[PDB]
Design a protein around this ligand. Sequence first.
Ligand SMILES: [Zn+2]
Ligand SMILES: [Zn+2]
Ligand SMILES: [Zn+2]
Ligand SMILES: [Zn+2]
Ligand SMILES: [Zn+2]
Ligand SMILES: [Zn+2]
Lengths: 89, 89, 154, 77
Amino acid sequence: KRFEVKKWNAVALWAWDIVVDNCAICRNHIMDLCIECQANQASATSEECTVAWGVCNHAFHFHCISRWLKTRQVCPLDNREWEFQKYGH
Amino acid sequence: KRFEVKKWNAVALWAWDIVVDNCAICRNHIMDLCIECQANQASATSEECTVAWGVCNHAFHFHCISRWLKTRQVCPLDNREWEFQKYGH
Amino acid sequence: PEYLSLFIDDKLKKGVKGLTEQEVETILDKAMVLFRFMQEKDVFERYYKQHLARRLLTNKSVSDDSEKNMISKLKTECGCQFTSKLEGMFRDMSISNTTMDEFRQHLQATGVSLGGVDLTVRVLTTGYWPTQSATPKCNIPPAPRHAFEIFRRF
Amino acid sequence: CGCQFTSKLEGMFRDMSISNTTMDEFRQHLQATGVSLGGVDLTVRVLTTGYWPTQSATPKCNIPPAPRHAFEIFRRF
Ligand SMILES: [Zn+2]
Ligand SMILES: [Zn+2]
Ligand SMILES: [Zn+2]
Ligand SMILES: [Zn+2]
Ligand SMILES: [Zn+2]
Ligand SMILES: [Zn+2]
């Protein structure tokens, strides 16, 4: 051949079993609102109902784990202190 | 063919990024005097202004790192204790 | 703040401007003093993190010693908050290089096909490094494709 | 002599250890490649400049093609 690849420097991103189809706290989805918001509008009045990403690569609705912080303080699928490293998908 | 090579016992020598063109302590060269000597003669009066080699395969002017030993004690391009394994190029 | 971040990235990518540490220390002190009388620190931190991603996901040997000085200056200027995210990103870089060592050990084990020649694969976490857009997709080299598939299997 | 020149000898032994480790590492990925018929039997030693003095002036001349390929593969690794 005329051109051949010797080295590769790909970067691999990983995500845990967040179950994009069932929120691990509310069991609706990784998007499309939550149990306490339901309808899309539901008198939104600004604020937000996006996805929250932790330091453990877990994703839930911001509302779900914001409320869950009052019940416990360690991400339910593990035993790690939950951070708020990202907001939205 | 009549003679074919089966085994080889080459020895490979390695050197770190000493930057032969730009001294890491005085941005001059790996030779050709230093910042505090400048001119070739500069009242040499014997002594020496050769290259100093450490145990970490780093090379600087002897004057540069001899003075630098008073500022710090770990080779700036790494965190290793600097030795004086060789003198001159 | 974006221009300040670009300036600090230009000063950090290479020590061409002043090989000795003295002038580097003085210019960094002047830069942080200038940043002290500045508002809108959120955009500054965001662009600093973007510059960190650009300089760590490219050719290394940037300084391999000034990162500690940068994090110390950040910890004494902003404090454990925005600088904590950069500490986490450095921990994630350590994770990636250890996983690269593990993949090299795996290639030494198998060592049978040409799928993984010098597969320098970096493993990062979603939270630290933002998505470029939506993870693009297209045809990739097949020997390295099977290498990536075996890395994924690991 | 005491802990003085013997320290240099210990450093030389450490360099020997480094050289053989870099040899087993080089080989591991040469077996993984196997491209050209130049790496049939290779024993490459990796040494540090400080421990072992340069012979005269680092001599250079054209290398036989099979050692050429072996050296190219080792340098790429
Ligand atoms: Zn939910
Ligand atoms: Zn909601
Ligand atoms: Zn978690
Ligand atoms: Zn110098
Ligand atoms: Zn001098
Ligand atoms: Zn050094």
